[PDB]
């Protein structure tokens, strides 16, 4: 009644190796991430996992350890990666763009409000479940940032480079919540043309450089809607002060547009 047969590998997490395991008697699936702990911080994973209960969350459902062999039990989500549905220098629909930004934003304040931070926002790390409801998944980089209701700065560069805050690359320290804002921004910048707008937020990178003077006839910008834009226009803030916070994102005229039947 709960012995799972390995019925296909899905990839690879920040540490270890996801597969399908489905129930022989139930016929239940789940997906088992496989951490050769051999060939701590896989500890905090699971410790940020067993904190995390919401529907844009992938669900945790326990931890067995078998020699070095660290096993995590999660949600399946049957719709694959929201990395697959981004045609390239394409984009998708901006109908559909919208809903799974408002599920990634719904996602991002949950943990935020317990105060987690993923560090690791992008495509690859965000699932789609039967119904193309959208979770974010993959806590091997998250870490916590408030506690006992005190904030504290991080330090660590973590992350992926076209995904990465600028303040990351130019900050001893810096404020969690406004880089996994900037990552958000960067997946919706992905999702409505098909393509990201530099390898790095460097002013090294020409593509980073045009954006902040503002060069948007160029691509990817040009194929943005004008109302999309100017959201992206408030979230790709290089100073993270003056960078839009998640409350006034839920005010934005785009964010609240009627768009999708
Ligand atoms: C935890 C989890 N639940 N469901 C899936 C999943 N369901 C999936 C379903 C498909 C379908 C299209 C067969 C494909 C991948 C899937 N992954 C995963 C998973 O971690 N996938 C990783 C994410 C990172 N990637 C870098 C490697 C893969």
């Known amino acids: 009644v709960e012995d799972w047969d390995l019925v ?18 139930t016929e239940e699936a789940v997906a088992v991430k496989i951490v050769d702990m051999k060939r701590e911080n896989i500890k905090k994973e699971i410790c940020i996992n067993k904190m995390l209960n919401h529907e844009n969350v992938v669900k945790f459902y326990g931890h067995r350890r078998e020699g070095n062999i660290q096993y995590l039990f999660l949600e399946y989500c049957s719709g694959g ?7 390239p220098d394409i984009g998708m629909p901006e109908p559909d763009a919208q809903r ?8 991002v304040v949950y943990l935020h409000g317990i105060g987690i931070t993923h560090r690791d926002i992008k495509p690859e790390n965000l699932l789609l479940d039967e119904r193309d409801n959208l979770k974010i998944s993959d806590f091997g980089l998250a870490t916590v940032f408030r506690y006992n209701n005190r904030e ?8 992926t480079l076209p995904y990465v805050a600028p ?15 900037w990552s958000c921004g960067i997946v919706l910048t992905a999702m409505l043309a098909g393509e990201l707008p530099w390898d790095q937020p460097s002013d ?19 194929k943005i809607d004008s109302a999309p834009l100017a959201l992206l226009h408030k979230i790709l803030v290089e100073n993270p002060s003056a960078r839009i916070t998640i409350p006034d994102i839920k005010k934005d005229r785009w964010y609240n547009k009627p768009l999708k039947k």
């Open 100 to 107: 799974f930004f408002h599920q990634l934003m719904a996602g």
């Open 167 to 181: 303040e990351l690359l130019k900050r001893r320290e810096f404020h969690a919540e406004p880089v996994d804002v």
């Open 152 to 159: 504290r700065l991080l330090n660590k560069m973590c992350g």
């Open 81 to 87: 990666e929201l990395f697959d549905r981004i045609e």
């Open 204 to 222: 090294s990178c020409q593509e980073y450089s045009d954006w902040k003077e503002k060069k948007t006839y160029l691509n990817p910008w040009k």
């Open 8 to 25: 296909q590998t899905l990839g690879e997490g920040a540490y270890g190796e996801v597969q399908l395991a489905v129930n022989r008697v």
